[PDB]
Design an enzyme around this catalytic site. Structure first.
Site, PDB file in Angstrom:
ATOM      1  N   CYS A  45       0.646  -1.417   0.034  1.00 18.44           N
ATOM      2  CA  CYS A  45      -0.002   0.126  -0.016  1.00 18.44           C
ATOM      3  C   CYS A  45       1.044   1.201   0.254  1.00 18.44           C
ATOM      4  O   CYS A  45       1.947   1.214   0.527  1.00 18.44           O
ATOM      5  CB  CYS A  45      -0.772   0.088   1.145  1.00 18.44           C
ATOM      6  SG  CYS A  45      -1.959   1.708   1.666  1.00 18.44           S
ATOM      7  N   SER A  57       0.589   3.652   1.780  1.00 19.40           N
ATOM      8  CA  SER A  57       0.879   4.112   3.176  1.00 19.40           C
ATOM      9  C   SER A  57       2.202   3.468   3.741  1.00 19.40           C
ATOM     10  O   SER A  57       3.240   4.194   4.436  1.00 19.40           O
ATOM     11  CB  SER A  57      -0.227   3.851   4.134  1.00 19.40           C
ATOM     12  OG  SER A  57      -1.431   4.564   3.961  1.00 19.40           O
ATOM     13  N   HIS A  99       5.046   5.579   2.347  1.00 24.46           N
ATOM     14  CA  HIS A  99       4.981   6.732   3.353  1.00 24.46           C
ATOM     15  C   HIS A  99       5.805   6.586   4.520  1.00 24.46           C
ATOM     16  O   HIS A  99       6.442   7.810   4.836  1.00 24.46           O
ATOM     17  CB  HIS A  99       3.501   7.086   3.823  1.00 24.46           C
ATOM     18  CG  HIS A  99       2.938   7.693   2.771  1.00 24.46           C
ATOM     19  ND1 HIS A  99       3.050   8.002   1.552  1.00 24.46           N
ATOM     20  CD2 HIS A  99       1.343   7.951   2.591  1.00 24.46           C
ATOM     21  CE1 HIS A  99       2.065   8.730   0.929  1.00 24.46           C
ATOM     22  NE2 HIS A  99       0.931   8.434   1.545  1.00 24.46           N
ATOM     23  N   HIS A 132       0.669  -3.719   6.561  1.00 25.48           N
ATOM     24  CA  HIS A 132      -0.593  -3.554   7.450  1.00 25.48           C
ATOM     25  C   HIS A 132      -1.615  -4.204   6.530  1.00 25.48           C
ATOM     26  O   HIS A 132      -2.866  -4.187   7.083  1.00 25.48           O
ATOM     27  CB  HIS A 132      -0.888  -2.050   7.648  1.00 25.48           C
ATOM     28  CG  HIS A 132      -1.065  -1.135   6.263  1.00 25.48           C
ATOM     29  ND1 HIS A 132       0.070  -0.777   5.908  1.00 25.48           N
ATOM     30  CD2 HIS A 132      -2.224  -0.734   5.810  1.00 25.48           C
ATOM     31  CE1 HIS A 132      -0.330  -0.001   4.497  1.00 25.48           C
ATOM     32  NE2 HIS A 132      -1.662  -0.058   4.711  1.00 25.48           N
ATOM     33  N   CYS A 147      -7.058  -3.024   3.752  1.00 20.13           N
ATOM     34  CA  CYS A 147      -6.845  -1.813   3.497  1.00 20.13           C
ATOM     35  C   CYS A 147      -7.454  -1.203   2.429  1.00 20.13           C
ATOM     36  O   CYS A 147      -8.276  -0.409   2.441  1.00 20.13           O
ATOM     37  CB  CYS A 147      -5.211  -1.320   3.829  1.00 20.13           C
ATOM     38  SG  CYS A 147      -5.073   0.268   3.680  1.00 20.13           S
TER      39      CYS A 147
END
Ligand SMILES: NC(=O)C1=CN([C@@H]2O[C@H](COP(=O)(O)OP(=O)(O)OC[C@H]3O[C@@H](n4cnc5c(N)ncnc54)[C@H](O)[C@@H]3O)[C@@H](O)[C@H]2O)C=CC1
Ligand SMILES: NC(=O)C1=CN([C@@H]2O[C@H](COP(=O)(O)OP(=O)(O)OC[C@H]3O[C@@H](n4cnc5c(N)ncnc54)[C@H](O)[C@@H]3O)[C@@H](O)[C@H]2O)C=CC1
Ligand SMILES: CCCCC[C@@H](C)NC=O
Ligand SMILES: CCCCC[C@@H](C)NC=O
Ligand SMILES: [Zn+2]
Ligand SMILES: [Zn+2]
Ligand SMILES: [Zn+2]
Ligand SMILES: [Zn+2]
EC number: 1.1.1.1
Lengths: 374, 374
Positions: free
Chosen positions: A46, A48, A51, A67, A174
């Site tokens: 993902c 994220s 990030h 995650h 997610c």
């Protein structure tokens, strides 16, 4: 047989910002009370997770990120009642304790036990289950799925359908659920409406799926990478626009296309400027704009509150507004019932050890979701 | 006797920013097609009229301000169907054309015929009905009630009950309906909830009445002028707080007082900083914050979008979200049935000629609403 024992396995450790992940031998402690140790089966890459690498999302390092995942329970700690060894499970990066004011509220889902607001990078008890050469390694959002094994608190895991294909349903952990819920639950897109979706990655495509499910008549995809448009149309976009093609601001273009502003807009990128653009392009009296993207840490946006005084509604959400432990099993059930599709999000499948190739693909613009398999 | 003729009468003309109103003779033209000339009976002094003086709210000068009023129809232009000479009426600073995309939308009320977004300060046909010293004088929001007579478009006036007390129901023309609707219609305050109301002037007191009508359990009034508290409690505030009494920022104080943030907050002042503070004090996962105050022209606020990403909703509204021509007569009927109170808002009554004294009373912090009588 490994119950109550330390497990030695491979995990992808991020030691420093802006570096590749490092595949390390780690030690994973057995679960303590109300904890669950999971053998990973599949995990999505993902934006994220990226990030954390880029410093857009700040969380203690070194860390095992990941995650968006699914696996099988290897063992449970004392007092666990919601899963058993052998169960298929999805880790929940937003917990659902069931006891806080948010979990008790009909609408809220940002459980107060989350590790997002003031990241510690631990289990609920303030300690880590991971070591690498005698050094503690932080957890990430109480999930940490870039590892052959992880340990999560019971409030951060949901039991799912025993027959579910984990290599697909990991996305419900997610990207799919965030984008779909942002449309159907947070914005509450209406039949016949016009929607604009900024950012056509995994999450934005899922927003499009949700808008289509809600019966939107027009779904305008917006991305600076025109290679993303084909897939956006496949999943329900009626038109796509690339701001780089225009000599004027895209909020103006979208206002003209929509004969005075869209009903619902979604920021699914993570830029301050596109958050304000997405707010502006919704109709001034009754439009709704939902922020989904994660922007750079500690940076504020600038906006004219007249945009809201005229009647706009601006909101954001985590995980599409879904109460995580209640919703994830139901979403898996809905997938099994062919209520939505996950294959359109999956562009690459790689063995876990090729994680860095998976991040290279995301960064290059070539992939939507790479699923890493174990 | 005046039908079809130019009327010479007194009005309060604002020639320049930051100057007293000048009470002088103006000429008011007869109504053209689909226009209505009104003999004013009573008008309130709203903070928004003061914003015209201070340059907080920009509209063309010179101008006849005033927008919160009630009067009696003196004459109608050709084609008018919804009012007749002798009817009691309230001018509508937010029109309701009934035909535009916003008027047709179930939730919108900011009719596209409004004169707020790109102010012209004219009638709908782009001309003025007012002359003073041989010069054309601008209208204000299609109302202009600081005059013994005014001319409005038919979409900007509502017929009200023939028995209504105009020296009270003028408040339904702005401050009451705006605050009340911001609570009951825009925020949709729920039974048992906790509300925070920033600004305890006439509009904030009306927000309180709305929160009370909605069955809120706690209504926390916030104002830096402690003299406002007594009236705030009389109309339903359960507690009042002065930010100046506390070492911590008030969003922190309110978050504490409410055991993690309020269900609904309202900015009813017109400051960029309190807009962000009011947003911040609502619960991070499911709080709702409504901007009602008018901030200084063209100025942007700065905020961290993480406030929205956790789940907050931020909205604003004009005139409490009420479709103006449908709602105003019903509000008057509800007032006549004592469903809400206007007397608590009225602290002073003065003859129109004392308009500058009325503005002095507002600026000094002394009054809530002064009603000017003609
Ligand atoms: N609120 C939540 O709970 C969650 C938030 N996220 C966030 O959602 C965002 C999207 O995630 P993914 O779909 O995985 O990312 P992604 O990187 O695959 O997709 C983003 C898309 O934005 C486009 N883009 C980049 N800059 C642009 C610009 N200036 N204008 C228009 N388009 C632009 C890219 O070309 C790309 O297609 C990320 O910020 C991520 O962190 C993701 C999941 C959960
Ligand atoms: N959105 C809409 O349709 C409408 C908006 N307005 C706006 O609503 C606002 C309120 O109008 P009124 O009640 O007539 O004004 P007002 O001036 O009587 O009341 C404002 C209150 O805010 C308080 N205040 C000032 N600074 C403060 C601070 N830093 N913290 C806390 N309280 C503070 C003052 O002491 C005063 O009691 C104005 O900006 C007005 O222009 C009014 C009617 C319509
Ligand atoms: C959209 C902004 C609404 C502000 C309306 C004020 C100026 N009207 C009366 O007080
Ligand atoms: C409130 C902001 C939510 C962001 C959640 C991200 C980091 N989780 C999954 O991608
Ligand atoms: Zn994610
Ligand atoms: Zn909880
Ligand atoms: Zn209209
Ligand atoms: Zn007003």
């Amino acid at each position: 047989s490994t119950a109550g024992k330390v497990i030695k396995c491979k995990a992808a450790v991020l030691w420093e910002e802006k570096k590749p992940f490092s595949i390390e031998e780690v030690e994973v402690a057995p679960p303590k009370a109300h904890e669950v140790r999971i053998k990973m089966v599949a995990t999505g890459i993902c934006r994220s997770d990226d990030h954390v690498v880029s410093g857009t999302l700040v969380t203690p390092l070194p860390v095992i990120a990941g995650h968006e995942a699914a696996g099988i329970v290897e063992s449970i700690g004392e007092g666990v009642t919601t899963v058993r060894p052998g169960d298929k499970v999805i880790p929940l990066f937003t917990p659902q304790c069931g006891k806080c004011r948010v979990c008790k509220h009909p609408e809220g889902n940002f459980c107060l036990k989350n590790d997002l607001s003031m990241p510690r990078g631990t289990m609920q008890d303030g300690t880590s289950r991971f070591t690498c050469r005698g050094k503690p390694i932080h957890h990430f959002l109480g999930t940490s799925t870039f590892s052959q094994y992880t340990v999560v608190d019971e409030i951060s895991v949901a039991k799912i359908d025993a027959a579910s294909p984990l290599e697909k349903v990991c996305l419900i952990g997610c990207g799919f659920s965030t984008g779909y819920g942002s449309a159907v639950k947070v914005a509450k897109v209406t039949q016949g409406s016009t929607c604009a979706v900024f950012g056509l990655g995994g999450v934005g495509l899922s927003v499009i799926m949700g808008c289509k499910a809600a019966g939107a008549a027009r779904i305008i995809g917006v991305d600076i990478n025109k290679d993303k448009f084909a897939k956006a149309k496949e999943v329900g976009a009626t038109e796509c626009v690339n701001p780089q093609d225009y000599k004027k601001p895209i909020q103006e273009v979208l206002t003209e296309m929509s004969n005075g502003g869209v009903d619902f807009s979604f920021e699914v990128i993570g830029r301050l400027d596109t958050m304000v653009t997405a707010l502006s392009c919704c109709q001034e009296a009754y439009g709704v704009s939902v922020i989904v993207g994660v922007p750079p840490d500690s940076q504020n946006l600038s906006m004219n509150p007249m945009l809201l005084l005229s009647g706009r509604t601006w909101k954001g959400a985590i995980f599409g507004g879904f109460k995580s432990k209640d919703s994830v099993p139901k979403l898996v059930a809905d997938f099994m019932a062919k209520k939505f599709a996950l294959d359109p999000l999956i562009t690459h499948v790689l063995p876990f050890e090729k994680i860095n190739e998976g991040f290279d693909l995301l960064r290059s613009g070539e992939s939507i979701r790479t699923i890493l398999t174990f």
